[PDB]
Each structure stands twice: as structure tokens, then as C-alpha cells.
Curated annotation (Swiss-Prot), chain A:
Organism lineage string: Eukaryota, Metazoa, Chordata, Craniata, Vertebrata
Subunit comment: Homodimer (via SH3-domain). Interacts with PTPN22. Interacts with phosphorylated SIT1, PAG1, LIME1 and TGFB1I1; these interactions serve to recruit CSK to the membrane where it can phosphorylate and inhibit Src-family kinases. Interacts with SRCIN1. Interacts with RHOH. Interacts (via SH2 domain) with SCIMP; this interaction is dependent on phosphorylation of SCIMP 'Tyr-107'. Interacts (via SH2 domain) with PRAG1 (when phosphorylated at 'Tyr-391'); this interaction prevents translocation of CSK from the cytoplasm to the membrane leading to increased activity of CSK. Interacts with LRRK1.
Cofactor annotation: Mg(2+); Mn(2+)
Reactions accelerated catalytically: L-tyrosyl-[protein] + ATP = O-phospho-L-tyrosyl-[protein] + ADP + H(+)
EC number(s) from the headed UniProt entry: 2.7.10.2
Comment, domains: The architecture of this protein is similar to that of Src-family kinases (SFKs) with one N-terminal SH3 domain, one SH2 domain, and a C-terminal kinase domain.
UniProt modification remark: Phosphorylated at Ser-163 by PKA, leading to increased activity. Autophosphorylated.
Name of the protein: Tyrosine-protein kinase CSK
Places the protein is found: Cytoplasm; Cell membrane
Similarity comment: Belongs to the protein kinase superfamily. Tyr protein kinase family. CSK subfamily.
UniProtKB/Swiss-Prot annotation, chain B:
Disulfide pattern: none
GO MF terms held by the record: ATP binding; connexin binding; heme binding; non-membrane spanning protein tyrosine kinase activity; protein phosphatase binding; protein tyrosine kinase activity; signaling receptor binding
Name used for this protein in its record: Proto-oncogene tyrosine-protein kinase Src
Source species taxonomy: Eukaryota, Metazoa, Chordata, Craniata, Vertebrata
Residues reported in the UniProt entry to bind ATP: L16, G17, Q18, G19, C20, F21, G22, E23, V24, K38
One GO BP: regulation of cell cycle
Organism in which the protein naturally occurs: Gallus gallus (Chicken)
Gene: SRC
Length: 249, 265
């Protein structure tokens, strides 16, 4: 888990999160994403995070490359480089003329698998949105930082417990996000009509030019009863079905 | 043709504006419909070069595009179009009513233009000359795109023209997004000339050196933010019109849920 700082050449700040400072590098030949944190020394709770990034790994998850802990308090995480970056920004600048059925379905699976995964390891993210996804040079979608009213499930907002059914709800939102090419969800509903209207049994309309097959997956994840929404297993089943039976093209 | 009609269908009632090509009139079509009639002044341009200006609009059709009704290919040549009673956006911005416009209306106007441009985008066309001057306004602040510019991506005003198009003729839809960026400035400054205190020749160079227009007075910082996104030196990562329409259409449900009616905005 250790890396020697000296042979790592920091390049530039690709990220300015009000929660952290992200940068590019190159250690021995491979470009790397280095999460730089000062914030006093409150770069700590991020070490507990950097921990489960060791006993939990999928190829659909941003691979934790290693950790550099120097004397002078330079606390820095090193993650695998996701070339293209934020999925939300990408969807928005490239739009439909670039991302066709194939491309969106790919993205969609590269997640339901990284989720199907964390579902067996007994895990729960609590923060599933496309601002939080990243993209590799060669069109692969990977999650980033473990944990926002609009994405949370209804039950979860009333309490403090986020199950695996909470995440299946946030997946629904994130699908709509994708087939909207990065619209903010709930397009014509005021910030505190969101939870009421939803609890009143409301679901967003099908994103434009959205394949019916996909919109059901969504509605599916938005079942009022958390027990009646699918799992990150049944989902991948439905996604492949759709995929294989070319229901996106 | 079939887009053709007889001169009698038409009654020319009030003249609206001029130009080298001829004139524009408000008229009645079949005694029942207000229309705008574009007219060829004989000998100025050729019936073909003229009637070519309406070709594209036989194929395209969209709520936020000023639509084509009919032509008259004969000796006094006519193009017949929908009537946008308030004239051009720019003129309007500068007028009595232009000064009373508050941000939400201004934003929604942008949304509407964006809505049309978005359609142009789906269709693989390019507008080429985007600015409030080339936008028409109807009753109730309805804004549409018009009969100037659009080829399919199958004379520029420098200030509105993206560097790569101004330099290489790389007129793309992203080039149009850039213009939409400058367009936004006109909207929020009551129609002022972008890059004030800068001459055309100077402008392109400044822009090359990374220069971008500051946030205008009383324009929100999220808005000016969107603008700079449109002005990204790199075509590929400028926003898409789909997102622009979306962004503006939801501006108040997302970006600024606490808008405070300013003095001018």
C-alpha cells in the first residue's frame, strides 16, 4: 500500500472539490489521480475511506493505486486515472451525437456491476449520482468517492439508514440522469415539492429518446416499497436482456 | 413547386423593414392569416439566390423556428413567413419594453432560443450567424430563429464568431454555441455591443490570448459561468444545446432558487 513520493511527478489540478483537491501524476510510467488533502490535518476520515478501498475492489470501481504518507504531513491518496473524468460533464458536452444506445448502455452496466459487486460485500454508498462517476480513456465508467436530497430514497431521508434498497433507488435517478445526458432531476418541481410529491407516488417522465426497455428499469428502481425494487443482480439481468436482445438500438 | 401560391391569396398591408434585397410587409394570406412577406426588388439579387434563402425551411419545422408558409416565384418574387409582431430581438432589447425586462423573462427568452437551436442540433444543421439581431420576437416574449444562415454540417460578425470558425472557417454547431454565449451577453446587458471598447481587429487576438468578457452588471455569477462554458477555447467541450435548453429551462429550480429582483435585473 506504500509508494515512495520521490519518483512521483505531480502534473496538474484536474479537480477542485470543496471536499478535496484532485491532481494528475505519473509514477514510473502510468498516469495517476492523486487526491491531495490539507484541510488542517482533517485529511483523516479519508484514511478510513482509503481503507475499505483495499478490502473492497471491482474493475468497475476506481482502483485504489496506493498511499503516500510523508513526514511533512502531506497526506495524499493515489487512485487509478479516469482519463475523461466526470460522466455528467461528458454527457453534457458530447450529447446524443456521440453517445448512442451502445455508449449509454455500456455506462449503465459499468455501474450496475460495480453495484452488484458492493451488494454482496454487504456495502452501501449512500451518495449515488453521475457527478460521482468518472470515465476512462477507453469508455469505461467507474465510481469514485464513498458517501443530496434529489438522489436519496424517501425512507433513507426520514432516517439515517441507507440499505441496498436505498442505493437501488439512487440508481434509478442516475439512469434518468444518463438518458437525459446530465439534466438535473425533477425538471419542473420546486426543491421542497420533491419529497412530498415523490412520496405521493410520482416518478419522472421517460428521458427524451429513451428506449422503453430502459425506462421500466428506472420505474422499477423507484418502487414505493423498498422490498419490491430489484437488486443490483436482477438489474444486470434486465440490462443484459435489453442489451443482448438489442432493446436499446 | 407546391409551396407556390397566387398573388391574390396575399394582401400587403404594413411595411416592416428594408434592405438591399427589397422589403418586408405584414399582410393577410387568404384574408384570414397575418403573415410577413419578404420581397425581391428586381435586379438586386436573382430569383434563385433569393428563393434559395427559403429552401432550407421547407425541410425544417419547429415551434421555436420562424416557419415558412409559401412562395411566389414570379416577377415580383415573394417569400411568405409567420409574423413575429415585435420585430428583431436586438431592437426590442434596446426599446421602451427592453428596459423593463427582468431576469426570469430574459432567462426564459434564452431558453426558447436554446430550444430552437437544440432542434437545429438534432437535425445536423448549422446556423452560422447567431445574435439578437437575427432572432425574432412575437407577442408575449416568444422568441424564434430565422431566414438567415443555415447550411447542414454534412459573412461573420467577428465579435459573435468562435475563434476556430473565424480563423479556419470551422463553422460547426459548437461554433454556434459560442455565439449563443455572446448572445447571452446581449440579453443581459439590454443589447449592448459585446466587447465594449474593443475594435473588431483587436477582439480576435485578445480572445486568442484567452480573453473572455467579464460577468455583466447584475447578471448572476452562475449565468456568467454558463457563458464561459460556451466560450471554452476547445469546441469539443462547449456545452450542447440540449443542455443549454435544460439549464435555462430549470435555472430557478436548480441553479438559483433564491433570486432577488435587482435594480436592473
Amino acid at each position: 500500500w506504500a509508494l515512495n513520493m520521490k519518483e512521483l511527478k505531480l502534473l496538474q489540478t484536474i479537480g477542485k472539490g470543496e471536499f478535496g483537491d484532485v491532481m494528475l501524476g505519473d509514477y514510473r510510467g502510468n498516469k495517476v489521480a492523486v487526491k491531495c488533502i490539507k484541510n488542517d490535518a482533517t485529511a483523516q476520515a479519508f484514511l478510513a475511506e482509503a481503507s475499505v478501498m483495499t478490502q473492497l475492489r471491482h474493475s468497475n470501481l476506481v482502483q485504489l493505486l496506493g498511499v503516500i504518507v510523508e513526514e511533512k504531513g502531506g497526506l495524499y491518496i493515489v487512485t487509478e486515472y479516469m482519463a475523461k473524468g466526470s460522466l455528467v460533464d461528458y454527457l453534457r458536452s458530447r450529447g446524443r451525437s456521440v453517445l448512442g444506445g451502445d455508449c449509454l448502455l455500456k455506462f449503465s452496466l459499468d455501474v450496475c456491476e460495480a453495484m452488484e459487486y458492493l451488494e454482496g460485500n454487504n456495502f452501501v454508498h449512500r451518495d449515488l449520482a453521475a457527478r460521482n462517476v468518472l470515465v476512462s480513456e477507453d469508455n469505461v465508467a467507474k465510481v469514485s468517492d464513498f458517501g443530496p436530497v434529489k438522489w436519496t430514497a424517501p425512507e433513507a431521508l426520514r432516517e439515517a439508514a441507507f440499505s441496498t434498497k436505498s442505493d437501488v433507488w439512487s440508481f434509478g435517478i442516475l439512469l434518468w440522469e444518463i438518458y437525459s445526458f446530465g439534466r438535473v432531476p425533477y425538471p419542473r418541481i420546486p426543491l421542497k415539492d420533491v419529497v412530498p410529491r415523490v412520496e405521493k407516488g410520482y416518478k419522472m417522465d421517460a428521458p427524451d429518446g429513451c428506449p422503453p426497455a430502459v425506462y421500466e428499469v428506472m420505474k422499477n428502481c423507484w418502487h414505493l416499497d423498498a422490498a419490491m425494487r430489484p437488486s443490483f443482480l436482477q438489474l444486470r439481468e434486465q440490462l443484459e436482456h435489453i442489451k443482448t436482445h438489442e432493446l436499446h438500438l | 413547386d407546391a409551396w407556390e401560391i397566387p398573388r391574390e391569396s396575399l394582401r400587403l398591408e404594413v411595411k416592416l423593414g428594408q434592405g438591399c434585397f427589397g422589403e418586408v410587409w405584414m399582410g393577410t394570406w387568404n384574408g384570414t392569416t397575418r403573415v410577413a412577406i419578404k420581397t425581391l426588388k428586381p435586379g438586386t439579387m436573382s430569383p434563385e439566390a433569393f428563393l434559395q434563402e427559403a429552401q432550407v425551411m421547407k425541410k425544417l419545422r419547429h415551434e421555436k423556428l420562424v416557419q415558412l408558409y409559401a412562395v411566389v416565384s414570379e416577377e415580383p418574387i415573394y417569400i411568405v413567413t409567420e409574423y413575429m409582431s415585435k420585430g428583431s430581438l436586438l431592437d426590442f432589447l434596446k426599446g421602451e419594453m427592453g428596459k423593463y425586462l427582468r431576469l426570469p423573462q430574459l432567462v426564459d427568452m434564452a431558453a426558447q432560443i436554446a430550444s430552437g437551436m437544440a432542434y437545429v442540433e438534432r437535425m445536423n444543421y448549422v446556423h452560422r450567424d447567431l445574435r439578437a439581431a437575427n432572432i425574432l420576437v412575437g407577442e408575449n416574449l416568444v422568441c424564434k430563429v430565422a431566414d438567415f444562415g443555415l447550411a447542414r454540417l454534412i459573412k461573420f460578425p467577428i465579435k459573435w464568431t468562435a475563434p476556430e470558425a473565424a480563423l479556419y472557417g470551422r463553422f460547426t454547431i459548437k461554433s454556434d454555441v459560442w455565439s449563443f454565449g455572446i448572445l447571452l451577453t446581449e440579453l443581459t446587458t439590454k443589447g449592448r455591443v459585446p466587447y465594449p471598447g474593443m475594435v473588431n481587429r483587436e477582439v480576435l487576438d485578445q480572445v486568442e490570448r484567452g480573453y473572455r468578457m467579464p460577468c455583466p452588471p447584475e447578471c448572476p455569477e452562475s449565468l456568467h459561468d454558463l457563458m464561459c462554458q460556451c466560450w471554452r477555447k476547445d469546441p469539443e467541450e462547449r456545452p450542447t444545446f440540449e443542455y443549454l435548453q435544460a439549464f435555462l429551462e430549470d435555472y430557478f429550480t436548480s441553479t438559483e432558487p433564491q433570486y432577488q429582483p435587482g435594480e436592473n435585473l
